[PDB]
Amino acid sequence: GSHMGSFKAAGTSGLILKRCSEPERYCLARLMADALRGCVPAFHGVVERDGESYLQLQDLLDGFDGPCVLDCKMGVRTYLEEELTKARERPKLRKDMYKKMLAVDPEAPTEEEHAQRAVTKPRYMQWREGISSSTTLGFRIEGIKKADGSCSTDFKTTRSREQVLRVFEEFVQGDEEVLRRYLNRLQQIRDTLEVSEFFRRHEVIGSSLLFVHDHCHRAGVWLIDFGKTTPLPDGQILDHRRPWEEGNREDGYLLGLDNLIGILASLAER
Ligand SMILES: Nc1ncnc2c1ncn2[C@@H]1O[C@H](COP(=O)(O)OP(=O)(O)NP(=O)(O)O)[C@@H](O)[C@H]1O
Ligand SMILES: O=P(O)(O)O[C@@H]1[C@@H](O)[C@H](O)[C@@H](OP(=O)(O)O)[C@H](OP(=O)(O)O)[C@H]1O
Ligand SMILES: [Mn+2]
């Protein structure tokens, strides 16, 4: 029906406001003119509310009757290469990130991080990639919202192919029509990404695929969250499958989508 951190209710039916960020506004504007137009929420421009700038977006939940939502962060890498430079030259030590790390694996921090009670953001995000499916499969499940109002973010150690398959199995609750529609949509999104002028020219970091379905078997998938999507310099391009090595700006986005399609196709045959 409706999603209502960065989000505020819109006056217009079927819309939602997201706090405006310059990289995301730039990306959504380009995307409305790109092959990927239909694969992302409609962007209607910027509006002012309480002296603050908001993106006016399609409410992706509007068409659905009690939507189930799964957020799937795409890519082998989940931070910008400029974070690695900033961490080397002027590290901003993060005490919060030390605690969240220690909570999962007490042996994960180094002797020096224990002494600092703090880690760098890139170190934290790299660790998060390795205990989840990000490093190996190129995506990870971030969270689910169920039709029963229940929600979960308890997926930080969901890593193996079979562990991911079991989360989707529980998410679709044996609805063969929803799974088939999800797979048809992912196949069409992959085809669109492989021809998109935007996609070949941009490093797509920290974006998600949002899976939405309802008890009426309606099913949609959209790309969201372009806050860390940045253009490559002087007409250089990415293949989005080859391994990341600092300098090459590769994000493994399509490695992730390939594996995600493979897992849902496997689930469909179970
Ligand atoms: N256009 C949309 N319509 C409806 N729901 C949306 C829309 N965009 C985002 N959402 C919901 O809001 C969540 C957060 O979206 P996102 O754009 O990733 O924001 P964020 O502030 O970067 N949050 P996060 O990724 O968790 O750090 C999604 O997982 C959806 O549940
Ligand atoms: O999910 P946990 O383990 O809490 O970690 C979050 C991570 O999920 C999120 O993606 C990061 O934001 P970003 O994607 O804009 O970099 C955030 O950074 P920050 O906003 O704290 O700097 C981390 O703290
Ligand atoms: Mn996000």
Author numbering: 183 to 186, 196 to 461
Publication passage describing the model:
The structure of the IP3K kinase domain (IP3K-KD) revealed that the inositol polyphosphate kinase (IPK) family conserves the protein kinase (PK) fold organization in two lobes, the N- and C-lobes, binding the ATP in between them in a similar way. However, they present a third lobe, the IP-lobe inserted into the C-lobe, which accounts for most of the interactions with the inositide substrate.
The main difference is the shift from the InsP3 site in the scyllo-derived compounds. We observe that the scyllo analogues of InsP3 and InsP4 (1-s and 1-p) with an inverted pseudo 2-OH group (therefore with all substituents equatorial) are better ligands for IP3K than the natural ones, exhibiting IC50 values of 36 nM and 51 nM respectively, compared to a value of 140 nM for InsP3. In this work, the identification of unusual substrates (InsP3 and compounds 1-s, 5-s, 6a–s and 7a–s) that expand the reaction center’s distance from 4.6 Å (InsP3) to a range of 3.8–5.8 Å suggests that IP3K phosphorylates a range of substrates possibly with a strong contribution of a dissociative mechanism.
